[PDB]
Every structure is written in structure tokens, then in C-alpha cells.
Point group: D3
Chain length 161, copies 6
């Protein structure tokens, strides 16, 4: 009973934010064109997903995520549209603390080329609850050419133990 | 990056299945200082959306998560919107946990007069005084709140006390 | 042979509308009641009382109501602040898709302050999507003003 | 007291184009299905818990958002367009759909058509909900791994999801 | 020409009944097994194992099972303390509303003695099923009838 | 004003999909001191309703929120109620977070069952690991398939 050992390792968790760009376009017709002042959108406009691991849980689907993980766990966030950034493109450019404890280290952008991808990576360094704000640019495409629609952010919630 | 974080004002509605209560609690307390416990299964709680605010929409427990600073305003009604049986909140208090919310304040709201005829479909039938219970999140952590309400039944164009009841719900602030 | 005593249920349905969300996302809506503005089910919440053989996705704007053939329903609508500031008032319910599970809805007035409910009975088996139209008023200086006319589409099935 | 005619409330119902994204937890599949099929006409079954499905909102459209089974409810006349990706958006491992077919129930959907979308090349699998009823669909996909930047086929898999139209 | 090798699935379903909630909310229940007292689906949870083309609302007392025509089901019931204290024992399953998706159920005895209620989805459509059970309380190393109850749950086959 | 708040006794049932485990983890630990990790996806956790208690009913992770002072009693079983294959909990211990719960005690209930009981004695959030043995029904005998653990989440206020 005091001889049961449990292998306990740091997890590496992939998170994908899936954004309903059509919905956003419809509900925010005149958004910010300043990336330093992004337009707040509600969490109803997107979906967040993550892979399972021991000690990790979430409200899968919810744009809020409600992630609970272990101190020590690494996270990697990417964003895309419902058509996987094939038409409109939703492209995250920053992740920052919004409320609560500094659970996560400052996020680092990492590029992955081949199509260029970008993930935003951190580690749960402290126990607590934290709300994160993630900013993204939304582009449309017309003559097979991207054009900026606006800059937006949403807030999501995480906790580590 | 400027996010312009500001204190939100969240409206919360508790919708109580009064028929269910009356069937499951046929002999409840008639002393308002000693309300009858009901499960959160007997009601539903809803709240409006805001950045950094989430909940278990529909569940009587709510599971509200919001920002220190956010204001909340709580009202209660029945599944028939207090048109027959009425469920009327008279108190909110801390049940467990940190005092995340300030003690609540009852505020009286007078319903507006009607819109002009040009603005009202004839298809609509439309005096009420309402009460809401306001607070603000002021400390980080987790709190369980007890909300006590009077259940009145409609007898013949007249209300009669059925009983006093309370449920517990859960909230947290960051 | 066991006797369950199945009989018709009477289900109360409450639609709770996030009027502040609507006003923000549909700033120039329809002012024609014969032509309401579509809103997504994310902008409201639907609730119903429990009963034998009735289920739903409680709190979802779509409801996904599953009930018995023979069951009565009574629908009402209000805002998150219980129509005390902004007000959301149902004025019509109609078939949008699917089978004619429900009889045509009929408005009922309920006296003292004045309320209205929209009632029907599930007379056939199958799946039906229903559109509910409502007027949204804002309140300014103890007076109401029309903001716009909207509709949402919800889903129901009877067995 | 403005007259509203209850018999001409017009909702302007139109067919919706629903975009659906399947997000596959490829790391889970590799661990839990270490000996998959390498024959694409005989893909290996995976549980709907291995993946998430998401769809855009529209009137009369609903789903269990996030769930791999979807439980999609839509209008007869609507068009679905399905794409597939991993949790890392196919940047490392990649999950690529190659077929969608009827698995059980009514023929709600016409046979799906693969459509190319260009200016990376992207493919979506599209169909119109042509009849009322309930159908379960099987979607087959290839999972390719990258180890040390070497891309190879890991296996062919399929999951089943559910949809209904009225 | 893709072969899915579709096969009939055998789904295990477990109904877990919150017997304390029931006892406190139904002080005078039916004592006649032919007239069981209806309980709300909020009073229990239903669980099932996963399989291709099988889904449910996992944990909800109504279940919302969607399965394939040809799939078999086996239902068992137990309390939150696995029938070690209060016991919930199913004794019948029957059609409440809807189509005859499932054949009449067969009680099967398993050996320390359990009973399962088995059937097969023989027809496409939507069915509501009523499951009746006996709730017994544990007194002093002794079990006594508290009452007879049923709940209604929902299933569909395609 | 007076709510007569009472300490609650919460029964928790873990229902393990033994067929899923067998398929997913064909070569598990045969050493009970060193159980094999499984995803909370392979099981379901449920608990009784009570004031101040909530959970994500069904999820293998539970996400239980209860009150300091509340007792928990945990039992485990298969989707066939341990009538064929059997899943039998033999240990519960802290995995992560605050020590919200006292050490768990096994209690025998008399055909013979075992429960694992604790009380929430401090406020905070704790992850717990629960270990169990999975046995398969040979004919009318039991054979050991493997030892496993899953991780679930609880919080007290």
C-alpha cells in the first residue's frame, strides 16, 4: 500500500483552436485593423481541442477550453479555420496572460515550414488558474490573393496542479 | 498588445422547475429563515457571455468562472416565467469556500411602459416590479453560494405560499 | 404484464434570449415583423421541465427536444434579465423543416403582469424543426423602443 | 397594435453550406493501433474517441460539437464539406481523408465528391443532404508520419460518424 | 471499393441508479411490481461501451443511444455502491413509445448471481424503453423492499 | 439565513470498459507495484447528487467539486458489473496538487465488495491515481490480465 509506484512524466499536449471565420465576419463587419489593439470576440465563435493524457482534461469543443493539466506539462497551440485555412485564414500571433496566476511561462512562437505553420509553446510552470488571451489575424482571399479582414482576440481558461 | 480588459457585467438567470419541486417536496418549510434544501437538478442557471467568463450553461450548479472585478446580477423565475407558480429569490449567501463575491444587494427594477402601437405586433399580449441581486467578484478563488427563494402557487388569480427553498451553486474568479 | 400508465405530458419550454449579444452582433436588424432576422442558436438558451420519456439538450438554443406523441408543449420567452430591461417577446411559431409533428401553435394569454405562451400538441411521430419569431425591445428612460424582429430555429422529435 | 399577418412571416430559408473539420489525435492512433492496415481498400477501424468533429453554425443545424461521432442534424438541401487534419494541423504527422461512404441507415447524402482547393493543396469531400432520415457515414483516411523529417505511410484508418436530416 | 468489414456489435450498457436520491424523493413508492413508480432520468446514469456507429450521451439517465440495426445490447443495473448497500435490481424492460427497434428482451442469468437483459436492434427507427427495477434497502445485514420503480430511456437504430 | 449545512457522504462509482482496455493495452504490467497507465477515456466515473457537489458525470476524469468535510467512498466495476471480466480497485493515492483528501482506507462490505474511503480535509485541487486489477473470465475461473491506473481530478472548497 506504500509500495505502489506510478510512472509520472511531463506531458506534451497539442491544442488546436478552430475558428468560425464566417461567423466572425458576419458578427464583426468593422473590426480593428490595428494588430496592437485586437477586437474581442466571444468564445462562442471558435472551438478548442486537445489530445488526452493522464492528468489532463478539458471541455473538448468549447472555445473556452477549460484546460486542466499538471505542473510541468508542455502545451503547443495552433489555430486554423473550419476549412483548415484553405479559404479565409485565421493566424494566431500572440498569446498572453489575461487574468489570474502566471501558470504558464511566456509563450514562444515556433515556425514549422513544410506551407508555413506556427505554434505557440509554453510550459505549466506554476500551480494555479490562469486566463489567456490569444490574438489572431483573419484574412480573406479573392483573386487567389489573401487580404486582411481584421485583428481579433479571445480569452480561454487553464489551470495546473 | 492592448486588450483593454475591463470589468464585465454578467446577467444570471435561475430558472426553477416549480412542478418538480412541488412533487418532490410536498411538505416544505414555511419558515423563510429555514429554507428547504433542493438539489441543483431541480433548476437550470444561465448567464450571458463575456470575455473570460464561462459556465456549464443550463446546469443548476452553473460552474461559473469569471474575472475578479466582474459584476453579477442574479434573477430567478419559473419555467413559465412566474406567470403561474412564481419562484422569487429573497436571499443569497456564502455556503462554502472563499468569499469570492461581495455580499449581494437586492435592487428593485420597475418594468418600462409599452412601446408605441406602430412598434408592437398585434400578435403580442403585453406592469411588473422585479428584483435582482447584484454583487461583484472581489477575491480570487472558489465559492459555493446558497440562493433561497419563495415558491408561490397561483390559486385563482391569487398567490399562496407553498414553501421556502434553497439551492447551492458554484462559482470561481481569477 | 406491467402497467406503466403512460399518458400525455404537459411540457413547459422557456427560451432565454441573450439580448445584449443580439444587439451587439445584429446592430441593424430587420424592422419588418413579416421578415425577421435569423439569429444563431448560440444567442439563446432553451429549457424544459422533465417528464417520463421527454429529453433534451438542456440549455442549448437548439433544444433537441425528444418527446412522446400526444404530449402538449407550452413555449414562453424572456431575456437573461427576465424582460425587466431589454425585452424579448415571442410573436409566432411555425414549421421550418421536417414533418408536421406539432399542431399549429396557438397563442394563449395569461392574466395577472400580462404574459403569453405558445401551445401545441405533438400529434404525429417524426422530426420537426420549428422557427420562433420574436420582437426585441430596449428600454430607455422607463420607455420601451423596438430594436428589431428576429427568429431562431429549434429541433424537436416525437415517438 | 400593428397588424402582423401570422400566415406570411417569411424566413427566407436557403440551403446552407456547412463546413465540417475532423481533427484527428494522430498520436493516440499510433499508440493504440500499432499494427494498422497498409491496404487502403481495407482500412483499420478506429473509435470515434480518437478524434473530434466540428461544424459551423447555421439555422436548423446542430451537433455535438467536439464529439468524433458529430451527431450532426441538418436541413434537407444543405451541403456538407468535410476536411480532415491532425491536432497539429498536419504540420508533423498528417491525416488525409481519401473517401466517405455510407455505413448504415438511409441514403441521406448523395455519394461524396472530392473537391480540390488550391492557392498547399487542400481537398474537401462534399455532399448534399438529399433525403430526410438518419445515416451513419464511414470516412477513411491515410495517416503519414514524419520521423526525423522523413515522411512515410503509417496506415489507413476509418471512423464512423452520424448525421440526420429533416 | 473500400471494405469496412461491418459486423454486428455487442454493446454492454450499465444503468447506475442514485438510490439515495430516490429514497429521499419518493417516500411512498409503489409496492406492487406490476405498477412501478416512474422516476426522472435525473435519478440515474446510463453508460455503454464504444463501438463503430454507436454513440450516446454518456452518463445521462436517458442515454440517447444510437446504434446500428443488427447490434445486440445487454443491460444491467446497479446502485452507486454497486448494490453492496441499497440494491437496484432490474426485472423488466418493455417498449414505452415509438417503433419496435428492439426485440422483446431476454433475461439471462450469469454466475455471485447476476442478471442481464439482452436484445437486438431488429428494425430502424426511434424507440423509448421503460426499465422497471426493485429498490431494496439494507437494514442490518438484511435487505427489505423499498419500492418498485421505472425510468424511460431513448434509443435509435440506423 | 440558517441552511443547516451538513457534511455529505458521496458515493463514487468508476465503471471500466474492460474490453476497450484489453484491445488497447494487450501487454500490460503483471506487477501490482508498477501498474500500467491508462487514459481516463477508457472509463466512466459517476457520483450521487448532493448540495455543493458537482462533477462531469460520465467522464473518466470526474472533475469532482465538493465541500471540505465531505466523505467520499469509491468503488469500481466493469460495464457488465464484474460478472465476466472483473476490474477491481486495489489502491488510491495522491498524484498531483494539494492533499485535499486524507489517505484512502479500504473497507470491506459483506458477495464481498471493497470500497475506498476518504474525507476532503483541506481546500484545494488534487489529482488522484487509482490502481486496479483487470481479470478475465477463463471458463468459470479468473485470470489476471493486468494492473492499471488512471488519474482523476477533484477539488474541495
Amino acid at each position: 500500500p506504500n509500495s505502489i509506484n506510478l510512472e509520472k512524466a511531463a506531458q506534451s499536449i497539442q491544442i488546436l483552436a478552430v475558428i468560425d471565420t464566417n461567423y466572425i465576419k458576419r458578427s464583426h463587419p468593422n473590426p480593428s485593423l490595428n494588430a496592437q489593439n485586437p477586437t474581442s470576440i466571444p468564445s462562442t465563435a471558435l472551438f478548442m481541442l486537445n489530445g488526452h493524457a493522464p492528468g489532463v482534461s478539458s471541455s473538448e469543443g468549447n472555445g473556452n477550453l477549460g484546460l486542466k493539466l499538471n505542473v510541468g506539462d508542455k502545451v503547443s497551440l495552433m489555430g486554423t479555420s473550419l476549412a483548415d485555412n484553405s479559404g479565409d485564414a485565421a493566424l494566431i500571433y500572440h498569446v498572453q496572460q489575461y487574468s489570474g496566476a502566471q501558470v504558464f511561462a511566456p509563450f514562444t512562437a515556433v515556425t514549422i515550414e513544410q506551407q508555413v505553420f506556427q505554434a505557440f509553446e509554453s510550459v505549466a510552470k506554476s500551480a494555479g488558474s490562469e486566463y489567456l488571451a490569444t490574438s489572431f489575424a483573419l484574412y480573406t482571399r479573392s483573386q487567389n490573393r489573401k487580404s486582411l479582414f481584421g485583428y481579433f482576440f479571445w480569452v480561454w481558461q487553464a489551470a495546473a496542479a
